[PDB]
């Protein structure tokens, strides 16, 4: 009981930093949460169904601009029912944002790994380079054992 | 297997929640005269 009452302080202090991840862990269900002052407003995230082709774009650079670049890879959600083509970008934990509003000052010597399903797609200097399966990346465990 | 992606629409103030306050801990009265 004492340990739970203490970890409540860590949970309360870390919600501002990442509300969606903590709310998805607590609720045991993928949600999107905002901090509306002293409360948390959650919303369910429906999984992307079939008849949907998610295409991964090659460059993370803004068109024409050179001092500005995107932070996460861009995707093109091609449709099969003829409903057009949505263009967003790759969020975190396989979340597909429907917009490209995550920009950043274009850093030099850029190297990042992004999670695209079961793979870690690698982008070096804002361009696709290679990919590696998730099961191939080495793991570290935060889990303490009790046998 | 097949990777599953998600789509998170922007939340709305409809469902607001809060962290539950800390629970009191039971006093175990183990001990006899």
């Amino acid at each position, epitope marked *: 009981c004492q340990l739970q009452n203490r970890e409540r302080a860590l949970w309360s202090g870390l919600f501002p930093i990442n509300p969606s991840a903590l709310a998805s862990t607590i609720l045991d269900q993928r949600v999107k949460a905002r901090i509306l002052g002293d409360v948390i407003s959650v919303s369910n995230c429906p999984e992307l169904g079939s008849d949907t082709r998610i295409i991964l774009q090659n460059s993370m650079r803004v068109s024409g601009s050179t001092t500005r670049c995107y932070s996460r890879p861009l995707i093109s959600i091609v449709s*099969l029912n003829g409903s057009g083509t949505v263009e967003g970008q790759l969020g975190t934990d396989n979340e597909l944002i429907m917009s490209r509003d995550l920009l950043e000052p274009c850093v030099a010597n850029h190297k990042r790994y992004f999670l695209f399903g079961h793979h870690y797609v690698y982008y070096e200097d804002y361009r696709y380079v290679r990919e590696i*399966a998730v099961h191939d990346v080495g793991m570290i465990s935060t889990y303490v054992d009790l046998n | 297997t*097949k990777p599953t992606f998600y789509v998170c629409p922007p939340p709305t103030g409809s469902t607001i929640v809060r962290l539950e306050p800390p629970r009191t801990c039971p006093d175990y009265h183990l001990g006899k005269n």
Partner: antibody
Amino acid sequence: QVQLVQSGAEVKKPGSSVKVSCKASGGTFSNFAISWVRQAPGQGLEWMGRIMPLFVTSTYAQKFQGRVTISADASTSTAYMELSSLRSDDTAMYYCARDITAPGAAPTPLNFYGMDVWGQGTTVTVSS
Amino acid sequence: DIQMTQSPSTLSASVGDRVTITCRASQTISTWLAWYQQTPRKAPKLMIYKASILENGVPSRFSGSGSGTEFTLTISSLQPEDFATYYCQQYKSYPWTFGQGTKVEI
């Protein structure tokens, strides 16, 4: 649904071109990476190049790189596969496959969901 | 990779058999194999991509597995619409060289 159609029954003498067309039906043609395959009667299958959206490059295979040329329109929703060689070995059933993609896509096998929809078959003969 | 082998030519079977159409590879295709199906008077059609994933419009009796240079297409509950030629397709580096034979199951 989407439909791709070729020219039809073709008979060409060795020493000319063929110029096989591939008319589409939907899909805006901005999400079409037209590939072309073939197999002679009694052979398995082969691959003859892929033309990706913003159709200017048209990467070809190893064996037909000096022979075939593939192009598209993006306004007519068609794809042409002229050979102009007809070395008497060009007797197969040329197909017009199609993979779903987008312009500016990454050269990754994570963006290949197979040649989902196909054409009809040409049945070209090169002999007199 | 650039050249792939296949299974024997026929693999005769009857309705209700579990048939494997194993085909192999050269340079460790990392789960980048596709399977097709061409009846004698049709065009090939997608069955399996990524060596394990089914296509929309394909019954779930079809399966697939294998990760490197060893991929199998194990069918179960063979309804009488499985008597067709099958092909392995390699997409790891151009050219996409096709594979298997497996003419017909009769």
